[PDB]
Design an enzyme around this catalytic site. Structure first.
Site, mmCIF file in Angstrom:
data_model
loop_
_atom_site.group_PDB
_atom_site.id
_atom_site.type_symbol
_atom_site.label_atom_id
_atom_site.label_comp_id
_atom_site.label_asym_id
_atom_site.label_seq_id
_atom_site.Cartn_x
_atom_site.Cartn_y
_atom_site.Cartn_z
ATOM 1 N N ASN A 131 0.813 -1.209 0.000
ATOM 2 C CA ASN A 131 0.000 0.000 0.000
ATOM 3 C C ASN A 131 0.853 1.268 0.000
ATOM 4 O O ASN A 131 0.378 2.321 -0.440
ATOM 5 C CB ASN A 131 -0.936 -0.002 1.208
ATOM 6 C CG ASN A 131 -2.251 -0.709 0.931
ATOM 7 O OD1 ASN A 131 -2.688 -0.809 -0.211
ATOM 8 N ND2 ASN A 131 -2.897 -1.189 1.983
ATOM 9 N N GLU A 162 -0.384 -21.499 -16.498
ATOM 10 C CA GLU A 162 0.646 -20.766 -17.226
ATOM 11 C C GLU A 162 1.340 -19.747 -16.337
ATOM 12 O O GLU A 162 2.539 -19.493 -16.505
ATOM 13 C CB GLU A 162 0.048 -20.069 -18.449
ATOM 14 C CG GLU A 162 -0.248 -20.996 -19.611
ATOM 15 C CD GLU A 162 -0.527 -20.240 -20.904
ATOM 16 O OE1 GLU A 162 0.182 -19.244 -21.174
ATOM 17 O OE2 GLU A 162 -1.449 -20.647 -21.655
HETATM 18 N N1 LIG Z 1 -5.483 -1.310 -0.527
HETATM 19 C C1 LIG Z 1 -6.389 -1.528 0.414
HETATM 20 N N2 LIG Z 1 -5.966 -1.944 1.657
HETATM 21 C C2 LIG Z 1 -6.883 -2.172 2.630
HETATM 22 C C3 LIG Z 1 -8.241 -1.992 2.389
HETATM 23 N N3 LIG Z 1 -8.905 -2.292 3.522
HETATM 24 C C4 LIG Z 1 -8.006 -2.658 4.466
HETATM 25 N N4 LIG Z 1 -6.750 -2.576 3.932
HETATM 26 C C5 LIG Z 1 -5.489 -2.907 4.590
HETATM 27 O O1 LIG Z 1 -5.693 -4.111 5.335
HETATM 28 C C6 LIG Z 1 -5.077 -4.024 6.611
HETATM 29 C C7 LIG Z 1 -6.133 -4.231 7.676
HETATM 30 O O2 LIG Z 1 -6.838 -5.431 7.396
HETATM 31 P P1 LIG Z 1 -8.404 -5.459 7.000
HETATM 32 O O3 LIG Z 1 -8.609 -6.104 5.667
HETATM 33 O O4 LIG Z 1 -8.993 -4.070 7.057
HETATM 34 O O5 LIG Z 1 -9.138 -6.284 8.163
HETATM 35 P P2 LIG Z 1 -9.814 -7.718 7.900
HETATM 36 O O6 LIG Z 1 -9.145 -8.417 6.759
HETATM 37 O O7 LIG Z 1 -11.303 -7.521 7.693
HETATM 38 O O8 LIG Z 1 -9.537 -8.483 9.297
HETATM 39 P P3 LIG Z 1 -10.423 -8.154 10.612
HETATM 40 O O9 LIG Z 1 -10.346 -6.680 10.938
HETATM 41 O O10 LIG Z 1 -9.909 -8.964 11.756
HETATM 42 O O11 LIG Z 1 -11.858 -8.538 10.355
HETATM 43 C C8 LIG Z 1 -4.381 -2.672 6.687
HETATM 44 O O12 LIG Z 1 -3.003 -2.885 6.468
HETATM 45 C C9 LIG Z 1 -4.987 -1.846 5.561
HETATM 46 O O13 LIG Z 1 -4.026 -1.011 4.982
HETATM 47 C C10 LIG Z 1 -8.668 -1.573 1.136
HETATM 48 O O14 LIG Z 1 -9.865 -1.410 0.909
HETATM 49 N N5 LIG Z 1 -7.733 -1.341 0.147
#
Ligand SMILES: Nc1nc2c(ncn2[C@@H]2O[C@H](COP(=O)(O)OP(=O)(O)OP(=O)(O)O)[C@@H](O)[C@H]2O)c(=O)[nH]1
Ligand SMILES: COc1cc(OC)c(Cl)c(-n2c(-c3ccccc3)cc(=O)c(C)c2-c2ccc(F)cc2)c1
Ligand SMILES: Nc1ncnc2c1ncn2[C@@H]1O[C@H](COP(=O)(O)OP(=O)(O)CP(=O)(O)O)[C@@H](O)[C@H]1O
Ligand SMILES: Nc1nc2c(ncn2[C@@H]2O[C@H](COP(=O)(O)OP(=O)(O)O)[C@@H](O)[C@H]2O)c(=O)[nH]1
Ligand SMILES: [Ca+2]
Ligand SMILES: [Ca+2]
Ligand SMILES: [Ca+2]
Ligand SMILES: [Ca+2]
Ligand SMILES: [Mg+2]
Ligand SMILES: [Mg+2]
Lengths: 438, 351, 54, 418
Positions: free
Chosen positions: A206, A254
């Protein structure tokens, strides 16, 4: 025609998937209600775009996707979004209390509760498949569900679907948008558990997407919508070869055979160009050589690293739009003289090139400009191990004090799995060092 | 105010740079593994380059160039010169050299040229060196290849064999050998700055061409000269002759100047070496910037031709010049990136 | 520089460009590990409620 | 949907709790009768976290009011919002606790605790997914001090997998109104170390100096101090009451704030340009606990900004303070400062900043209390009031040792290196 099923796990996986499928529809001309006027085969077909979309007798085109999160705030947006019509409810799965940024809570405590329900819904999609290629798994390293539940689902999928391929689209943590201090723990643990179950994993840091949005789109403070918009473009160009006619990367297998000669080093580095701002009414349209040369600048990579100080094991070039092979060969030959490109001795110095005449598609109102030619380069370079080194160092600093470890042990995990997972990454770092260093 | 970290406590050069920065009143020193720094004065081996440039809101600068090791280590440098079109296996200012591994290798080729010139009865004094040895040891000079190739298998680290310069320029009085050290600073823009002041590291014993069992008359290191010879210190203080005095000797004894005869070749060699590796180490489009101070070692033959013998990526200065050079590092390499509140000592080599 | 295996169709075009030639656990094991972690959680909750009963 | 249960115990806890509900009811557009009269709809997206919805689209706080004496209970019902609380959730005794920790914990509070848990149970069964509990109380008295930690111990036994938060008023370094506060505080801290996930440390002397020096209130009252606490309590719960992803529930907050289980005592802060706000919230003079952050190191930090502002400016200003004062942040917990922003500002302000810090400097407070406690216990002064309710001397010795251990632990990590 063979089918692929996309699995989106956690908040990040769901929201990126929600952007990818909006972009897939625009590329194929599928309306929010699932109607594709350009499809002349109603209720069926073995077209290449049917690898990602099912069909109903009523003329609707349904993504071959399943969305799973352990809390409803994110998936309920899908149930009410512009493309709520597109899906049917058996594909969307929700819990009630999330994993709390805890890998062990999503893997052991809550994973066990909902794993079997998820596989059943996956099995419903597979029963509709004449020949199933494998899975595309979108998730994050940092989240509790993204790291914990994904690594559990990968294990089961290697069982229920033994010989079918699995590809990850993972979100490497970046502090500027990170929601948790323990993301380094969650990344090392999930990587260790999934390494032997993933055939090819495209990491996205990110930090790189964030800076690209600041540098090239002049966005003061990028949001997940901004980041996902761009991520969808990179994902689309990578999956384009599975959704359109072609002879390069038309099968999930692939990807492994073209990009992964060493099973454990299955983390290719993606690079995308051009990223231009739409607020710039017009710009000098860039040449094939210019956009191709941009693919070797770190500022345009998905992971900020220096390929000059590693070695390539494979490289692929995926062009979209007004590109002919003679332009590509000229760009490659001229670039090879000015750049420091070193392959491993046991691989040819080559480039597998794919072209698709349809120019890249942009979402209306988005920050990305309509361009006539674009390119995405997927290179398996050892320099991506810089990311593992960064993440391991953060893991070491906190684990030296056992900081936050009690949250994982309280969920049934053992302190041994911390050391066991870390040792695996120590081996992975040294595996990357044998290949790419003298 | 800016922040910096020190990670090579043995660096005498950057020890004084550290003292200078704190005297600024605009730089605070943090501890070794604090990651929130502007400037890293890093360690000498296994510097973690992959972790720099990833701290938000911090322009990070480091005092080493990743990949410089290909130039500052004997085995690497020989391979670099031979395998680069820029520098050309037919290179004029680098002595005929060969990389040889004990117990990819070039031993078979070194003997080819050795017999080729004993066929013509030309001198066959070769020298073996390696980056493992030090303290005036790990080095052997002989005219017979057998004495040298047996000596390398006696070791366990890679070595290089190089054609010994049998006809060096000998300073008079003394009829003694010498080598030249030039200090070069490369900033983040990859500007190549040459320090106006160089030094001649001298042998205080007359150059005996007959017996190579003797070391001191041939090796000009500041260590062995201080340690295996009593006439150390007779002609010049600490066996260190500086350019103003050497300029006068060339004029008075050879009707020439340091600039024309020697210095112009030095600047050419420096440009060629660094400009050859710019594509592989330049950081003008990276997330972290680099600078590095190099020390180039040269030999001069009786024809006033200049030869390069090695390069040091982590060199030491001369005691008389620490103040002037170490402050120049601050203004050109550090303050260029991190300005302070409000003639030149360097030669810029254009490309 | 060779240009081999050029495949050409309506949607696009694919080829290769050589520049230089060269020189899993069972399902039972999964359930067992997930159970061992559930046991460890229950033992910790037992030790807690035991100390609260005390 | 993820509902929190609120409890207030003792004269101190109820007074603070009542103004907490005044602040957030206004923030969510609820009037004293329980009806919504607000402008935006973000006010209701997460209203169910702190409010139950009852027939007639009236919103009733999920609050339980407790005290061993009825006096302060009658003042709550006569206050501005006293009409809003569920009348069956007032659980009061008649005796009082007399500043006796043993009375609130063992004898007088024991007879009333089951009546409280019956209300707690009835609220929890009405939750789609119960999240945790939060408690407001003081550690110097007998009811909120002694009976409060009894409820905490009882609640954990019924809901051991739920988060337990507390807003605890600590004894002050120089101002006190009760002679035996060292005994009551030391006995409560022993409980909180073991049975709470997050505790916010508030002392009145710091609040009073703010009221007198900064806000320029020439004659401050507990009324003025409580307005500060309620404003802070609103700020620390903003991420729980309004849409967001960072520290959006109690467990996620605890996982980001508590590296080691026993070190879960936080130093709150509030303030009052963007560069100005960020400088204030970090200042010692804006802290609600009498501990200098410059006498320790921050293990973790959480900042919450409210109102319309340039996130770019905020993100840039938070990083400067971190990089400016690197010495005061542990090097072995990378990126331990987390920042969140909400568009909704508080009333009267357009921009606010709330600060939550887990600093090792908090040990100073636990040392002050330990020194005072030992001075009394070595001579067994005032002890007959406690042993007379059935306590043994060794319960005091253990409570002292645990706090001395807690002080040692805080020092251990204050000097740790990388
Ligand atoms: N690029 C991007 N990164 C995201 C997004 N949402 C969360 N993140 C990243 O994911 C990490 C946090 O994990 P999340 O996906 O939000 O949480 P989760 O997978 O739902 O896990 P739980 O909170 O335990 O339910 C952080 O490092 C954020 O930067 C998104 O919509 N886009
Ligand atoms: C904590 O112990 C106290 C000791 C004390 O006198 C030594 C006082 Cl006056 C108060 N106190 C009282 C009060 C309490 C009990 C009996 C009568 C009056 C009411 C009130 O509104 C405020 C603001 C304060 C107060 C608080 C913190 C300060 F730093 C300064 C004054 C509290
Ligand atoms: N090809 C050659 N011809 C003549 N003399 C040579 C030579 N190669 C090396 N020497 C002599 O041997 C000495 C030591 O060589 P070298 O410079 O490799 O040692 P070193 O690497 O320890 C110097 P430093 O300590 O600055 O790194 C030099 O002073 C030089 O005079
Ligand atoms: N902030 C605040 N603190 C109070 C108030 N009343 C009492 N306290 C604090 O609590 C202590 C007295 O305890 P009390 O609240 O009477 O305990 P109780 O016996 O449980 O009701 C004093 O040390 C005060 O600091 C109040 O109205 N506001
Ligand atoms: Ca069809
Ligand atoms: Ca497998
Ligand atoms: Ca009674
Ligand atoms: Ca009962
Ligand atoms: Mg989540
Ligand atoms: Mg050397």
């Amino acid at each position: 025609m063979r089918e692929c099923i996309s699995i989106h796990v956690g908040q990040a996986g769901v929201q990126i998937g929600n952007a990818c499928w909006e972009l897939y529809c625009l590329e194929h001309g599928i309306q929010p209600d699932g109607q594709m006027p350009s499809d002349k085969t109603i209720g069926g077909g073995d077209d290449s775009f049917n690898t990602f979309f099912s069909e109903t007798g009523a003329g609707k085109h349904v993504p071959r996707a399943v969305f799973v999160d352990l809390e409803p705030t994110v998936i309920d947006e899908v149930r009410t979004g512009t493309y709520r019509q597109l899906f049917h409810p058996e594909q969307l799965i929700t819990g009630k209390e999330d994993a709390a940024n805890n890998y062990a809570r999503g893997h052991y405590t809550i994973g066990k509760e909902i794993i079997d329900l998820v596989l059943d819904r996956i099995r419903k999609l597979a029963d509709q498949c004449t020949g199933l290629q494998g899975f595309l798994v979108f998730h994050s390293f940092g989240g509790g569900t993204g790291s914990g539940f994904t690594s559990l689902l990968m294990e089961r999928l290697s069982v229920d679907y033994g010989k079918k391929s699995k590809l990850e689209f993972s979100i490497y943590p970046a502090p500027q948008v990170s929601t948790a201090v323990v993301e380094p723990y969650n990344s090392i643990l999930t990587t260790h558990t999934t390494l032997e179950h993933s055939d090819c994993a495209f990491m996205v840091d990110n930090e790189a997407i964030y800076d690209i949005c600041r540098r090239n789109l002049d966005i003061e403070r990028p949001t997940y919508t901004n980041l996902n918009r761009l991520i969808s473009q990179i994902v689309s160009s990578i999956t384009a070869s599975l959704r359109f006619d072609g002879a390069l990367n038309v099968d999930l297998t692939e990807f492994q055979t073209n990009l992964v000669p060493y099973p454990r080093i299955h983390f290719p580095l993606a690079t995308y160009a051009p990223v231009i701002s739409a607020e710039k009414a017009y710009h000098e349209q860039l040449s094939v050589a210019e956009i191709t040369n941009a693919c070797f600048e770190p500022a345009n990579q998905m992971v900020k690293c220096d390929p000059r100080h590693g070695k390539y094991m494979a490289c692929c070039l995926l062009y979209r739009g007004d590109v002919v092979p003679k332009d590509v060969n000229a760009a490659i030959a001229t670039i090879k003289t000015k750049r420091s490109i070193q392959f491993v001795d046991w691989c040819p110095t080559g480039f597998k090139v794919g072209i698709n005449y349809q120019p890249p598609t942009v979402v209306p109102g988005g920050d990305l400009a309509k361009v006539q030619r674009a390119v995405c380069m997927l290179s398996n370079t050892t320099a991506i191990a810089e990311a593992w080194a960064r993440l391991d160092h953060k893991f070491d600093l906190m684990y030296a004090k056992r900081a936050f470890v009690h949250w994982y042990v309280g969920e049934g995990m053992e302190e041994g799995e911390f050391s066991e997972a870390r040792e695996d990454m120590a081996a992975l770092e040294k595996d990357y060092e044998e290949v790419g260093v003298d | 105010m800016y922040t910096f970290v020190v990670r090579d406590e043995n660096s005498s050069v950057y020890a004084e740079v550290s003292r200078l920065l704190l005297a600024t009143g605009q730089w605070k020193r943090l501890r070794k593994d604090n990651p929130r720094f502007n400037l890293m004065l890093g360690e000498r081996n296994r510097l973690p380059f992959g972790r720099l440039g990833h701290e938000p809101g911090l322009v990070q600068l480091v005092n080493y160039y990743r990949g410089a090791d290909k130039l500052c280590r004997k085995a690497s440098l020989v391979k670099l010169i031979k395998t680069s079109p820029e520098l050309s296996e037919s290179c004029t200012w680098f002595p005929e050299s060969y990389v040889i591994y004990p117990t990819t290798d070039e031993r078979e080729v070194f003997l080819a040229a050795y017999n080729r010139r004993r066929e013509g009865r030309e001198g066959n004094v070769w020298i073996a060196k390696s980056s493992a040895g030090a303290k005036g040891e790990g080095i052997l000079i002989s005219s017979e290849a057998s004495e040298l190739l047996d000596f390398i298998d006696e070791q366990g680290q890679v070595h290089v064999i190089q054609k010994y310069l049998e006809k060096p320029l000998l300073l008079e009085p003394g009829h003694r050998k010498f080598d030249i050290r030039s200090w070069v600073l490369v900033d983040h823009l990859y500007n190549i700055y040459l320090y106006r002041e160089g030094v001649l590291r001298t042998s205080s014993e007359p150059y005996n061409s007959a017996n190579f069992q003797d070391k001191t008359c041939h090796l000009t290191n500041h260590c062995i000269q201080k340690e295996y010879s009593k006439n150390y210190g007779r002609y010049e203080e600490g066996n260190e002759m500086f350019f103003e005095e050497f300029n006068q000797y060339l004029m008075d004894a050879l009707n020439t100047t340091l600039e024309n005869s020697i210095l112009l070749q030095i600047k050419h060699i420096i440009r060629s070496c660094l400009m050859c590796i710019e594509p592989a180490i330049s950081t003008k489009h990276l997330h972290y910037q680099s600078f590095q101070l190099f020390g180039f070692d040269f030999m001069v033959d009786e024809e006033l031709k200049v030869w390069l013998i090695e390069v040091n990526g982590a060199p030491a200065c001369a005691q008389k010049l620490y103040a002037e050079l170490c402050q120049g590092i601050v203004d050109v390499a550090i303050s260029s990136v991190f300005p302070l509140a409000d003639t030149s000592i360097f030669i810029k080599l254009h490309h | 520089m060779e240009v081999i295996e050029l495949n050409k169709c309506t949607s696009g075009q694919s080829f290769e460009v050589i520049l230089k030639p060269p020189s899993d656990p069972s399902l039972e094991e999964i359930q067992k590990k997930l159970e061992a972690a559930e046991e460890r959680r229950k033992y910790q909750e037992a030790e807690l409620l035991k100390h609260l009963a005390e | 949907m993820r509902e929190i249960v609120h409890i207030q115990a003792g004269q101190c806890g109820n007074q603070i709790g009542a103004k907490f509900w005044e602040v957030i009811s206004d923030e969510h557009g609820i009037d004293p009768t329980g009806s919504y009269h607000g402008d935006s709809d973000l006010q209701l997206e997460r209203i169910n976290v702190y409010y139950n919805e009852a027939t007639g689209n009236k919103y009733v706080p999920r609050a339980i009011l407790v005290d061993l004496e009825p006096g302060t209970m009658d003042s709550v019902r006569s206050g501005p919002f006293g009409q809003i609380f569920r009348p069956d959730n007032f659980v009061f005794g008649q005796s009082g606790a007399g500043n006796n920790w043993a009375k609130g914990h063992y004898t007088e509070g024991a007879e009333l605790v089951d009546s409280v848990l019956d209300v707690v149970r009835k609220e929890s069964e009405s939750c789609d997914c119960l999240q945790g509990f939060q408690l407001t109380h003081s550690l110097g008295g007998g009811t909120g001090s002694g009976m409060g930690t009894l409820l905490i111990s009882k609640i954990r036994e019924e809901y051991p997998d739920r988060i337990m938060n507390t807003f605890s008023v600590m004894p002050s370094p120089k101002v006190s109104d009760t002679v035996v506060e060292p005994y009551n505080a030391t006995l409560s801290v022993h409980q909180l170390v073991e049975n709470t996930d997050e505790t916010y440390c508030i002392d009145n002397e710091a609040l009073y100096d703010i009221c007198f020096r900064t806000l320029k209130l020439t004659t401050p009252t507990y009324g003025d101090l409580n307005h500060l606490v309620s404003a802070t309590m609103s700020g620390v719960t903003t991420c729980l009451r309004f849409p967001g992803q960072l520290n959006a529930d109690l467990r996620k907050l605890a996982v980001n704030m508590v590296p080691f289980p026993r070190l879960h005592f936080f130093m709150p802060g509030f303030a009052p340009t963007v560069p100005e706000l960020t400088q204030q919230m970090f200042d010692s003079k804006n802290m609600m606990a009498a501990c200098d952050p410059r006498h320790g190191r921050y293990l973790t930090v959480a900042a919450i900004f409210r109102g319309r502002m340039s996130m770019k400016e905020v993100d840039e200003q938070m990083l400067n303070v971190q990089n400016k004062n690197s010495s005061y942040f542990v090097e072995w917990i990378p990126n331990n400062v987390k920042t969140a922003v909400c568009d909704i500002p508080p009333r009267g302000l357009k921009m606010s900043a709330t600060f939550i810090g887990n600093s090792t400097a908090i040990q100073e407070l636990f040392k002050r209390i330990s020194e005072q406690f030992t001075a009394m216990f070595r001579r067994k002064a005032f002890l007959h009031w406690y042993t007379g309710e059935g306590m043994d001397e060794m319960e005091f010795t253990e409570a002292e040792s645990n706090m001395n251990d807690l002080v040692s632990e805080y020092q251990q990590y204050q000097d740790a290196t990388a």
